[PDB]
Amino acid sequence: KETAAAKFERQHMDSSTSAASSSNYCNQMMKSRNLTKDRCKPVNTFVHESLADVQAVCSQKNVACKNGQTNCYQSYSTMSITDCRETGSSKYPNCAYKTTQANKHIIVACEGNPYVPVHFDASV
Ligand SMILES: [Cl-]
Ligand SMILES: [Cl-]
Ligand SMILES: [Cl-]
Ligand code: NA
């Protein structure tokens, strides 16, 4: 039974690469992080920065989350991200994703002690 912090790490962190360099990145990563077990997760963003740099966002600019909560934080700098989104021809169990690499600010929700990211809200 996964903690919130660990679920964030599994779903969103990929520090081993600086950027997605292939159209198949999302297909491979969504499968290897177990996000296509039982269902195709429709949307998911991977962040290509160190874990420490992402955890540090919880001390940066405090903003509202899309749901109105006030424990969201926007990174001061842009970060290398890859957005993975299911295509129109995807359906379980043959999940298929479009890979879009970008450099954007991230917005995360933070909780706990230590105060760490638990939800990925958006990128700007
Ligand atoms: Cl897992
Ligand atoms: Cl996401
Ligand atoms: Cl402020
Ligand atoms: Na946690």
From Swiss-Prot:
Its EC number is 4.6.1.18. GO terms for cellular component: extracellular region. The active site is at residues 12, 119. Pancreas. One of its GO terms (molecular function) is nucleic acid binding. Disulfide bonds join 26-84, 40-95, 58-110, 65-72. It is found in: Secreted. Glycans are attached at residues 1, 7, 34, 37, 41. Substrate binds at residues 7, 10, 41-45, 66, 85. It catalyses: an [RNA] containing cytidine + H2O = an [RNA]-3'-cytidine-3'-phosphate + a 5'-hydroxy-ribonucleotide-3'-[RNA]; an [RNA] containing uridine + H2O = an [RNA]-3'-uridine-3'-phosphate + a 5'-hydroxy-ribonucleotide-3'-[RNA]. It comes from the Eukaryota. The keyword Secreted applies. GO terms for biological process: defense response to Gram-positive bacterium. Keywords: Disulfide bond, Endonuclease, Glycation, Glycoprotein, Hydrolase, Lyase, Nuclease, Secreted, Signal. Endonuclease that catalyzes the cleavage of RNA on the 3' side of pyrimidine nucleotides. Acts on single-stranded and double-stranded RNA. Belongs to the pancreatic ribonuclease family. Interacts with and forms tight 1:1 complexes with RNH1. Dimerization of two such complexes may occur. Interaction with RNH1 inhibits this protein. Monomer. This is Ribonuclease pancreatic. It comes from Bos taurus (Bovine). The lineage of its organism: Eukaryota, Metazoa, Chordata, Craniata, Vertebrata. The chain holds residues 27 to 150 of 150 of the full protein.
